């Protein structure tokens, strides 16, 4: 299964690949608003192990919190 | 102790500016293609007085180059201007009182009013009655100009921001002594609530 | 009259029979006519002088 490979990918956050992904995604999220529905989870494996299913009735909201 | 008066002035309760009878913001026209490449002209329709400001304002009419309209604007009236006069706006308008053109084109030693401190700001510097700035020297590479401000300071300015030729009208206003507290009271009533100062 | 009364009036009691009737006075009307005509004549003159100079050069 690909979910395991995605799991080690996301555990290698300091790698240049994941660092590039995180930088680009953070820029885009910052450009968006503070509270908006995502069309689908960004981390499907993490969502699945947190209890998300690809069914009608599960929604995902991407939200931004001020730091400090 | 208590909050002091100079500390209360920043809350803006009774220390806001009295701005009902003011005629608008005195701003140069927005930069555009015509002003950046050639020029356009306008007729000086009115010369009016707004409360709280020493300099008079010139109400000028241009014609919109993109649709069938006429645009009205308010300039800080340079001294010597008059109604029925044509004022020219743009890069290559010739150099005479009332015109506005970038400071990088005018020769050194030029007297200027309503100087624009950053390009596009529509005039910020030397716009009080009788004040002016001087174009000291140019620098083509890096496109920068030295300007002497009415405070005696010298500043480096981008050579592509506009400026009105001439001195601001209404000069010599502070040479007349206010003879009485009534005159001072009326002077500051049209500006804000700060006059009767206590030691 | 007070401005909202002008609805009841007829047109002849509101304007005069002339170009810019009831909106601009006769003196400035005639100066506008003269100015437009003489300006256009001067423009024709400068155009023909420009053409003559182009031919000369």
């Amino acid at each position: 299964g690909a979910y395991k490979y995605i799991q080690e990918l996301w555990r290698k956050k300091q790698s240049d690949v994941m660092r590039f992904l995180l930088r680009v995604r953070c820029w885009q999220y910052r450009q968006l608003s503070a509270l908006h529905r995502a069309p689908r989870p960004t981390r499907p494996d993490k969502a699945r192990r947190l209890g998300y299913k690809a069914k009608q009735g599960y929604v995902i909201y991407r939200i931004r919190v001020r730091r400090g | 102790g208590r909050v002091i008066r100079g500390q209360r002035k920043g809350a803006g309760s009774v220390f806001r500016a009295h701005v009902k009878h003011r005629k608008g913001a005195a701003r140069l026209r927005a930069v555009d293609f015509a002003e950046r490449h050639g020029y356009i002209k306008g007729i000086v329709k009115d010369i009016i007085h707004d409360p709280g400001r020493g300099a008079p304002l010139a109400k000028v009419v241009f014609r919109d180059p993109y649709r069938f309209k006429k645009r009205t604007e308010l300039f800080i009236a340079a001294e010597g201007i008059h109604t029925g006069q044509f004022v020219y706006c743009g890069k290559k308008a010739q150099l005479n009182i009332g015109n506005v053109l970038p400071v990088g084109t005018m020769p050194e030693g030029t007297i200027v009013c309503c100087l624009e401190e950053k390009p596009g700001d529509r005039g910020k510097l030397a716009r009080a009655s009788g004040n002016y700035a001087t174009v000291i020297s140019h620098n083509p590479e890096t496109k920068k100009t030295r300007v002497k401000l009415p405070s005696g300071s010298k500043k480096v300015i981008s050579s592509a921001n506009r400026a009105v030729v001439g001195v601001v009208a209404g000069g010599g206003r502070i040479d007349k002594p206010i003879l009485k507290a009534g005159r001072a009271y009326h002077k500051y009533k049209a500006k804000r609530n700060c006059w009767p100062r206590v030691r | 009259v007070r401005p909202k009364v002008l609805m009841r009036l007829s047109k002849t009691k509101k304007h005069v029979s002339r170009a810019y009737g009831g909106s601009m006075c006769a003196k400035c009307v005639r100066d506008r006519i003269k100015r437009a005509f003489l300006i256009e004549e001067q423009k024709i003159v400068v155009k023909v002088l420009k053409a003559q100079a182009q031919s000369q050069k």
Binding site: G1, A2, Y5, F20, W27, Q28 | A34, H37, G38 | -
Partner: protein
Amino acid sequence: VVNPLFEKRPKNFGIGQDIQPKRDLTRFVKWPRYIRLQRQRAILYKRLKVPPAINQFTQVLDRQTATQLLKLAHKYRPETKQEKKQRLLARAEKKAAKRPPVLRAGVNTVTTLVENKKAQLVVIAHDVDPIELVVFLPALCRKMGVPYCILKGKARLGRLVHRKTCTTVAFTQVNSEDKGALAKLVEAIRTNYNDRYDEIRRHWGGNVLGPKSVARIAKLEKAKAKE
């Protein structure tokens, strides 16, 4: 011969002279935030130094061979739901009175087939919107020795199956009449992808400036070249 009353009236669009015509302004419009964001995301992709593991998806299978790939895949389409209904009825009457080879869709199915070496070639869509779901798959395919190609369009890749989208498909078993065509496709694809993976893993991307910046740099370097 015609009316002298017909004359032309040229209109001079000089500075200040006349009102300009309504020309095209599509590159000066104030666009909505979503359009602006989605355009400058691509601009950012072209700016930044993209690591080779993400760069590798830009180098894509060419159109001319992709058409044979798709026409061969069109034979092994999985059954539509109505076709499955027909066959389920049909088995019902034949019981009341062999599994043809097909494509295997889904990143999970494809990756488990590849790591079991049950796959014969793998087609990967080039633009999965988290790239991380497929970014690891070319290297895995190389080490298992399975030929892989990168195809334009998850939409047209999932048009093979009868769904909206599909990330990867896998040829795992075909018929005799298509073994030769599959062999030709596999040899071409392995020459293009499998045998270059050193340069694929060491080929960075992006790092190209804007047209205005590169033009200004070109003018400056031309000046210094002349003198």
